[PDB]
Amino acid sequence: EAAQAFENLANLEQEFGKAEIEILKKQNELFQPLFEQRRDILKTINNFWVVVLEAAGDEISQYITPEDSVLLEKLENIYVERFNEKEPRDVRISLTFQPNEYLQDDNLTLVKEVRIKEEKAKDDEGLEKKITKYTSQPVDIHWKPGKSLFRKNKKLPPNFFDYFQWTGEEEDDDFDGATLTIFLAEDLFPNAVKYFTEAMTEEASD
Template sequence: MAAALEEAQVSYEELSDLEQEFDDVETEIIRQQYALSKPLYARRAELVAKIPNFWPLVLEQAPMDIDEYIQPSDSAILLSSLKSLSVSRFELDEDEKNGDPRSIAIRFEFAENEHFEDTVLEKKFWWRQSKDGYAGLVSEPVPIKWKPGKDLTEGLLDLAKAVYDEQVAQPKQDKKDKKAKVPLTEKQKALKEKMDQTGMGGVSFFAWFGYIGEYISAEESKQAIEEEREERRKRKAGEPVPKKDDEDEEMEDDDDDDELEEDLDIFPTGDAVAMAIADDLWPGALKYFIQAQEQDGASELDFETDEEDEEDDEEDEEAASRPQKKHKGSKN
């Protein structure tokens, strides 16, 4: 690929900058769409609030990207206790012009249930960018006040929160000082052991509230975005852009850190599930509700048909068991 670019006299940086401009346009579209659709979602919320079990029925029809993570025990709570679900672009709500529209908050409202005391569980996802070039959704663990013996995550969520708090409290180590791997703390060991015992196939959907992603602070993200914009500006103006020192070494160190963070994330695909809720389930809620109604109607029709068939079979059996009357003119 490098040879092809050299022959075409097009640099990788030029292609990367153009791709970033496409991303900027898509981000601006999200910003405008949110402003235009916000009053419509408010009207929808008023209407669906009058429909019993609207959101449980919607969630029952959830696309595979979400449904595959919902265990039977999770489904029992979601279908019996979920009162409302909503998605907001909370940074835009705080600052319409400067907020990042890719940051989302997903809010679940519950009726009283036997598993936890919370009536509201809200998880925020911030769109952040690191200095090594990574960009995506990051979050913080959201604790759940489980009732005694009712923790569907079996302690995973609590351990994830404890490890996260421990990580945040530690001063960030300079990349140049990372010559040797730092041993796991006692809390990290406990979390890793619990994850190994559980296995990802049996993790409750409520472990999703423990998703973290990468540890990227708001300050680091802001600085990384500003530096990238400045580099793009210089390249566009034909100004020289100095290469960063020890870039390869820093990338190698970051890879080691990323491995550790991924190993200790109790729901590694949490960002994908968040996007599936925000971009599919939330805007398509009416569609999924109608599907649920149609499916329910089809089930009732099948039930009625089965009942009619059974009645017909019973009538045929009764007719066959009754003695037949002889017609006039018949022979004995």
């Protein structure tokens, strides 16, 4: 009776979806006020977020170049927020910088908005398959002269700030912005103080 089983599984997957949506809303309700309070504290701590970014594992460190790191020292805060009620997986990632040698003063807050939507795509023999698609508008950054950290061609390996130009709309792209978005929103941001504290208690190699 496999036909019935898999039809029932499909029905059940829909219920799982509705439950996940309820959980996301509950999560946003409980954690956002705490993240807001945390944000006010973290802004007072020198180099908090650059230490966190470089201690969070390979998913981030694979992108961070020495030139990136210098700018990130002026990163005052990172905030992550699920802003779209009608699409609760959508995330806004905001980086707030102090004045620095890379960014013009009228562009010290870098905002990345990632739309995360259920889509479908024909597979093998033309069967529809549910996929979660991650897309975003490209974010133009007002770099000071000679200080742009945007690659112009994809011969160059992507650095951290290439994330802002990632759209998720290119078959081309080698930059896995979807995985980075998930890591930032679900791992790095919620566990920031732990990452910082672990980094501040790291020992030498010798």
